Structure formats: C-alpha cells, structure tokens
Design an enzyme around this catalytic site. Structure first.
Site, PDB file in Angstrom:
ATOM      1  N   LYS A   5      94.883   3.674  81.390  1.00 33.40           N
ATOM      2  CA  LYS A   5      94.285   4.167  80.159  1.00 33.40           C
ATOM      3  C   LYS A   5      92.840   4.545  80.446  1.00 33.40           C
ATOM      4  O   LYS A   5      92.220   4.025  81.377  1.00 33.40           O
ATOM      5  CB  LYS A   5      94.362   3.106  79.054  1.00 33.40           C
ATOM      6  CG  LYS A   5      93.877   3.562  77.704  1.00 33.40           C
ATOM      7  CD  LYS A   5      93.500   2.374  76.833  1.00 33.40           C
ATOM      8  CE  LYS A   5      94.585   1.315  76.848  1.00 33.40           C
ATOM      9  NZ  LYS A   5      94.459   0.362  75.721  1.00 33.40           N
ATOM     10  N   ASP A  14      83.342   9.735  90.709  1.00 31.10           N
ATOM     11  CA  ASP A  14      83.781   8.606  89.898  1.00 31.10           C
ATOM     12  C   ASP A  14      84.417   7.547  90.783  1.00 31.10           C
ATOM     13  O   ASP A  14      85.443   6.951  90.443  1.00 31.10           O
ATOM     14  CB  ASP A  14      84.736   9.049  88.784  1.00 31.10           C
ATOM     15  CG  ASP A  14      84.682   8.138  87.556  1.00 31.10           C
ATOM     16  OD1 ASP A  14      83.916   7.150  87.559  1.00 31.10           O
ATOM     17  OD2 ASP A  14      85.410   8.417  86.580  1.00 31.10           O
TER      18      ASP A  14
END
Ligand SMILES: COc1ccc(C(=O)/C=C\Nc2cc(OC)c(C(=O)O)cc2Cl)cc1
Ligand SMILES: [Cl-]
Length: 260
Positions: free
Chosen positions: A14, A124
C-alpha cells in the site's frame, strides 16, 4: 474479481500510488504482484513504465505488462512477485544483524550500480522498497519518482521521494541544482542505518524539523546495538551532508565493511 487473465487476490502492499495486490494469472497458473492506480500528473506514471521497460537486472523488479483501458479509471502494472516482501519495516525493535545488513546491502550496491549505468536515479531508496525474493536476495522496487538522464549524471532541481530519506542538498527551498547519483547514495546510507538500528537517523513528526535535522543535525549513533567502527565510517561517509565529498558508489564497493 477478475481483470482479463488476472484474478486479484489480497492486498500485499500500500502507498500513495494506490495498492499492490497479489494476483493469479489463469493462463500460466502463476502468482504476480499487481500495482493498482486510480487517476485523480498521470504522465509521471507513464514515465515510470518507460523506465521500467528498459530494466533487466537480478536486483531490480520486473514489470511484466500494463493493462490500461481508456474507459476505466484503474491502471494496472503487473510485476513479477518478489514473494517474501520488504526486507524490513521502519521503525522496528528487531533490526538486522550486521552480516544480514551486509548481505542485503551488497544487493543494494549491485542494483544501484546497474541503475546508474542505465542512467536512472532511483530517488526512493528505502528498506520498504527493497523486496526479498525467493533466493533471499533483494530486488529494488518503486520507480515511481525515478529520473532518467543524459550524460554522466542527473542535474536535478525537484524534491521528491520519502522525506526521512531525502538528501540535504535537495531541501534548499531556493530551487538549487544538485546532482543525482549522490542522492541515491545518501538514501542508501539512511537505509543501511535503518538496517542496523531499526529507525531513521533523522526523525521528527514536524516536517520543518525533519528538514532542519537532515540539513543541520550531526549524525548520531545509538550506544545500542554496538556496531563496528568500520560500519560507522561507511554510514558516516554516505551521510556526508556535502554531496561533493560524499562517498561514491565505486568507493562503497571497496569499503572495508562491505568487503569483509
Ligand atoms: C510479505 O509479502 C509481500 C510480497 C510482495 C510485496 C510487494 O510486491 C510490494 C510492492 N510491490 C511493488 C511496488 C512498486 O511501487 C509501489 C513497484 C514499482 O512501481 O516499481 C513494483 C513493485 Cl513489485 C509485498 C509483500
Ligand atoms: Cl522504509
């Protein structure tokens, strides 16, 4: 809950992009990771797909296909399942052992080196984007904010990624230019610190104070656990706030802690 040949099963990850669901391909009888997004720009999603398509390495995830219906809000990115999931969640009270961290960090090095050769800055890097595969090795995931560059390095001005992992030179707020490879090294350093300590080196729930600490708080090591001096040296070199003297990947490869 079917989508052409794919049957969407439970959610396994998620984030701000949407969700990742386990998925079953009836054609070839195999599980995959299904990244589901909802348009709400969308350009950036297609930039990732272009980058992902060019990538083929054992320490990088594999996009398998894209399912995009002009008449459906959802966009589907099918990845090869990296079946054991993220290498750790931050924070944790059971961090990795040094040898575990070394093992995984070695994968991180190979993957980051490959991406830079392919002229991709990941932007990231963090433990929860390092997926652990069937053989116990890490695969780098989430290219959602990656950049492609021409030349020997990226010259960047935008601030993206996960805040606790952003490099201080990307938080100028005067739109200064900074180089790209050193941003991945910094995040690799935050990541390795997380491996051994189970928390980021710079924490604050106030975003201003998190930025301030990243830019101006000297790196601090917890007394516990008592990690090796050579590992402290490596983390210290990766979290050099000056990107001009920060350690580069070819040096990280040779670092005493990495090679023992
Ligand atoms: C514990 O069991 C688990 C097994 C696998 C998972 C998992 O796969 C999670 C994230 N998946 C991904 C996300 C991406 O971005 C959001 C990208 C990309 O955009 O590059 C690629 C992938 Cl694969 C989770 C738990
Ligand atoms: Cl994380």
């Amino acid at each position: 809950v079917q989508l052409n040949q794919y049957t969407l099963k439970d959610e396994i990850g998620k984030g701000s992009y949407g969700v990742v669901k386990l998925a079953y391909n009836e054609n070839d009888n195999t599980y995959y990771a299904m990244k589901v997004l909802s348009k709400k720009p969308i350009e950036q999603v297609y930039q990732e797909i272009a980058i992902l398509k060019k990538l083929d390495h054992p320490n990088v995830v594999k996009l398998v296909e894209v399912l995009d219906d002009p008449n459906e809000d959802h966009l589907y990115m099918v990845f090869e399942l990296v079946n054991q999931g993220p290498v750790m969640e931050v924070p944790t009270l059971k961090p990795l052992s040094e040898d575990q961290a070394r093992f995984y960090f070695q994968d991180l090095i190979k993957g980051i080196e490959y991406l830079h050769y392919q002229k991709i800055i990941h932007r990231d890097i963090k433990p929860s984007n390092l997926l652990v595969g069937e053989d116990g090795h890490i695969k780098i995931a989430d290219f959602g904010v990656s950049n492609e560059f021409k030349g020997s390095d990226a010259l960047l001005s935008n601030t993206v990624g996960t805040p606790a992992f952003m490099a201080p030179e990307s938080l100028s707020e005067t739109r200064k230019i900074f180089s790209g490879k050193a941003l991945d090294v910094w995040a690799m350093g935050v990541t390795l610190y997380c491996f051994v300590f189970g928390q980021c080196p710079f924490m604050d729930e106030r975003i201003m104070c998190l930025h301030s600490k990243i830019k101006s708080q000297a790196l601090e090591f917890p007394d516990q656990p008592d990690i090796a001096e050579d590992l402290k040296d490596l983390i210290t070199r990766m979290l050099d706030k000056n990107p001009e003297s920060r350690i580069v990947v070819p040096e990280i490869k040779l670092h005493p802690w990495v090679t023992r």
